[PDB]
Structure formats: structure tokens, C-alpha cells
Amino acid sequence: MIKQRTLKRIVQATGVGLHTGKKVTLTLRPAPANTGVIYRRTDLNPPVDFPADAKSVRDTMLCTCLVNEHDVRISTVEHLNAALAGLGIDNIVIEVNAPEIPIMDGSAAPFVYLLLDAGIDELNCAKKFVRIKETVRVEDGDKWAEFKPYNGFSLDFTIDFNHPAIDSSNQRYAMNFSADAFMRQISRARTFGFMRDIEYLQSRGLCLGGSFDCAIVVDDYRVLNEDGLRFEDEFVRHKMLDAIGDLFMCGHNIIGAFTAYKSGHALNNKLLQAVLAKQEAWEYVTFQDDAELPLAFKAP
Numbered sequence: 054m055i056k057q058r059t060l061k062r063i064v065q066a067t068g069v070g071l072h073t074g075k076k077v078t079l080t081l082r083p084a085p086a087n088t089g090v091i092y093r094r095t096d097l098n099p100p101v102d103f104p105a106d107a108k109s110v111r112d113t114m115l116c117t118c119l120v121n122e123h124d125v126r127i128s129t130v131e132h133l134n135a136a137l138a139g140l141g142i143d144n145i146v147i148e149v150n151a152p153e154i155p156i157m158d159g160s161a162a163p164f165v166y167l168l169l170d171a172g173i174d175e176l177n178c179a180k181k182f183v184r185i186k187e188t189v190r191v192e193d194g195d196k197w198a199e200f201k202p203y204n205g206f207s208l209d210f211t212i213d214f215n216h217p218a219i220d221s222s223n224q225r226y227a228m229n230f231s232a233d234a235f236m237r238q239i240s241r242a243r244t245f246g247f248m249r250d251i252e253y254l255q256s257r258g259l260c261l262g263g264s265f266d267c268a269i270v271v272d273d274y275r276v277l278n279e280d281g282l283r284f285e286d287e288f289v290r291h292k293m294l295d296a297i298g299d300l301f302m303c304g305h306n307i308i309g310a311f312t313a314y315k316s317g318h319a320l321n322n323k324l325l326q327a328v329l330a331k332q333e334a335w336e337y338v339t340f341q342d343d344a345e346l347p348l349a350f351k352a353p
């Protein structure tokens with residue numbers, strides 16, 4: 054039987070908060086079967102829990118967050134959420150003593166190492182997958198995102214960004230998902246933005262933790278980071294990283310084929326909600342024998 058996963062032990066790391074520029078301590082905890090992914094703020098008293106749920110996500114001008122009934126938020130969950138999906142972590146409590154997840158290097162890779170430190174523990178309860186049964190498409194002008202039935206998990210993503218540092222040959226990326234492929238191909242791909250935008254935000258007291266150390270920073274013409282890009286198509290790899298995190302907000306790995314053209318956090322969430330809202334488009338499946346598990350979701 055394919056089992057749900059949590060962590061073996063509690064682990065802690067400290068990083069910089071993108072928004073405040075202050076040190077944030079992140080604690081990852083094992084959790085019981087079926088409890089899912091829970092983000093928790095422990096700066097607040099009492100602490101506030103935000104269960105990961107497609108309906109609780111909000112997108113801002115800067116990042117994604119989860120909100121509670123009172124619109125209290127926890128922010129910058131996008132890249133850690135992608136790492137959870139990548140390693141198939143079903144149940145976990147994620148604490149920060151601050152209003153935001155640390156930005157790390159702008160990618161998901163530092164979170165992967167932290168999760169490896171915590172270890173994986175298999176629980177005695179079947180892991181539930183969401184199987185796509187019908188085609189579902191959502192649109193935003195000329196932008197769109199789609200799920201189709203497919204016995205596996207594939208992503209095919211065309212980026213919305215247009216810049217001299219992005220050739221036409223580097224605007225699309227497609228992959229067959231797996232833990233190893235996520236780690237090797239996607240996890241290290243950084244977020245990105247304009248120097249003038251970062252300077253401007255910082256002049257307004259925002260994004261104080263923003264720097265070359267946590268993003269690809271471009272001007273109108275070129276990548277400014279002295280070491281350049283980690284991949285010739287790093288921008289679109291990062292957008293696939295984001296998509297993997299967006300889709301995992303339902304708390305289940307999905308068996309189907311994902312295709313997107315100029316999508317992003319908002320449209321990816323719209324697709325996820327559209328699927329879950331249409332009863333006949335999907336079903337929960339479990340695997341009592343490891344054989345019939347799509348290759349996509351094998352052990353790391």
C-alpha cells in the first residue's frame with residue numbers, strides 16, 4: 054500500500070524575510086495522518102494555523118499567501134509549497150515566528166535540503182491522489198491553463214515574461230514529474246524581477262530582504278547577477294516550480310496532464326478550484342499495491 058508521508062523529526066532553519074528584511078526562524082514538524090499541510094504563525098499569541106487549501110490562497114502584487122477567517126495572512130508560501138509537492142510530503146506543520154516564510158535564495162532548493170534533514174516517515178494510511186477524469190480548462194484573456202486525463206503527471210508550461218534575456222527557444226518547458234526530476238531540474242530555479250522595481254519597492258519600505266542573493270535581478274537589458282543564470286531557461290523553470298506549488302495547495306498529488314500558456318499563480322489556482330468544484334472531473338484514488346502507482350509518484 055502506498056502510504057502517506059510526514060517528517061521523521063523536527064528541524065529548524067533561520068533565513069531572511071523578504072518583506073521585513075528581518076531574521077525568520079522556520080520550524081518543520083511531523084504531523085499525524087490525514088491532517089495535511091498546515092502553516093502556522095507563532096509570532097502571534099495565540100498562534101494562528103492556516104491549513105493549505107485552494108480556497109484560502111490569495112495572490113498579492115508581490116507573492117502568494119494563505120488567509121484565515123479574519124484575513125490575517127501568512128505570506129511567501131509559494132516556494133516551500135513546491136518543495137513539499139516535490140518530495141510528496143502529505144502531512145506537516147510549518148511554523149514561522151514571523152508573518153512570512155524566509156525567501157532563502159529565491160528557489161525551492163534550500164527547503165529540499167531542510168526536508169532531507171527532517172527525514173521521511175511513512176504512516177499507516179493510504180496516500181490519496183487526485184485523478185483527473187475529464188478535461189478542465191480555465192482562461193484569462195489569451196492566457197490559459199488546462200488539466201487533461203493522463204496516467205502520470207506531466208507539466209507543459211509557456212512563460213508570460215518577455216525580455217532580452219529570454220530567447221524564444223527558452224520560453225517553454227515541459228517535464229514528466231518525479232521527485233528526482235523536481236530536485237534536479239526545477240528546485241534550484243530562482244524567482245526574478247527588475248532592479249528598478251526592487252529599488253522602488255525598497256524606497257517605499259517594502260521588500261527589504263530583497264537582493265541579488267534571493268533573485269535573478271535583470272535591468273531592461275540583461276541579467277545583473279555576476280554569476281548569471283543557473284540554467285539557460287531558468288525563468289520558465291521557475292514558473293514551473295511555482296505551478297507545482299500552486300497545484301499542491303489542494304494537499305494531494307494529481308494524476309493528470311497539466312498544460313499552461315502564460316499562466317501564473319492566480320490562473321493556476323483558478324484551474325485547481327475549477328477542477329475540484331466539478332465533481333465528475335476528478336476522483337480520489339489510492340494504491341494498495343505499489344505496482345500500479347504511476348512512475349511519476351515513486352519514492353525519492
Ligand SMILES: O=C(NO)[C@@H](Cc1ccc2ccccc2c1)NS(=O)(=O)c1ccc2ccccc2c1
Nearest residue numbers: 165166169170232233234235236237238240352353
Ligand atoms: O544526480 C543527482 N543530482 O543532480 C542526485 C545526486 C544527489 C544529489 C544531492 C543529494 C543530496 C542529499 C542526498 C542525496 C543526494 C544525491 N540528486 S537527486 O537524484 O535529485 C537526489 C537527491 C536526494 C536524494 C535523497 C535520497 C534518495 C535519492 C535522492 C536523489
Ligand SMILES: O=C(NO)[C@@H](Cc1ccc2ccccc2c1)NS(=O)(=O)c1ccc2ccccc2c1
Nearest residue numbers: 115116131244245246247250251260263264267268
Ligand atoms: O516568484 C515569486 N513568487 O512565486 C516572486 C514573484 C515576484 C513578484 C514581484 C517582484 C518584484 C520585484 C522583484 C521580484 C519580484 C518577484 N514573489 S516572491 O518570491 O515573494 C518575491 C517578491 C519580491 C522580491 C523582490 C526582490 C527579490 C526577491 C523577491 C521575491
Ligand SMILES: [Zn+2]
Nearest residue numbers: 131244291295
Ligand atoms: Zn516563484
